[PDB]
Amino acid sequence: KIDLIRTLNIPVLTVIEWSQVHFLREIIEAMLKAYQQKLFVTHTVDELLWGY
């Protein structure tokens, strides 16, 4: 619960996939544009594996 693990950001690569199949396209493309995100994030072990 302290150990920080830096890797890809799987939810923001999930919702890019949803824009490719037109599952909520203009909703998600408004999210990542106005709220700029990170492809690489850093959370703890218990967050990245048991819900965050």
Binding site: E26, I27, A30, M31, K33, A34, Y35
Partner: protein
Amino acid sequence: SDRVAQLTIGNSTITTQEAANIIVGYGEWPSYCSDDDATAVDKPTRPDVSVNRFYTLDTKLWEKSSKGWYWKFPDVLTETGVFGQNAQFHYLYRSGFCIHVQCNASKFHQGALLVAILPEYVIGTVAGGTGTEDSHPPYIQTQPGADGFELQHPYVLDAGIPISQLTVCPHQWINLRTNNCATIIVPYMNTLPFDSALNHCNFGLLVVPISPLDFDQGATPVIPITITLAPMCSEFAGLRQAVTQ
């Protein structure tokens, strides 16, 4: 003498030769704040050319299964030009708007839009679906900016009010057999005579296709909708450093 028009203000003009007519919202033009109404005691700035221009913002493609879009004003122009620079430096703000939305099509396409204004267009959510969780809309659904935002449930306008009586508020139709543009001149409507330009969005421009687009296959399938707007009689006050949000 009504189908053909020209709207020149600032350094930018737009010509239209298949217009309907210009409607002036609530029967009065935008004007400056009189000294009966003003409460701020510093002298306002009035740029008078550099911000009273037709800003062409974005281009929404309209296909046969669209829902509708909305733009919150003036947060479509707090990122653009000398309006977006004066509204970020100055705390107070008032202006009217001349709102011109173009949508051309051939003489074989069909379909109608309801481009309408409505002041204080607050946005509700679906309340968690079943209607028991107090969900508030995010900041991007609230104030989408120049990108616009697409309506989820246009029958209730995402606010629990029906679109069937949106026609009370200042509006006009773009049906593609008669016109191709819709000018709506809107004064400054708000209680207090100036307000902040970053927090309060005075009105929202609902553009909803009610009668859907239809055309036989072979015609041009890309029918864009571009909105251009011009802040008229704009003035700012309360100078400080730049806030962006």
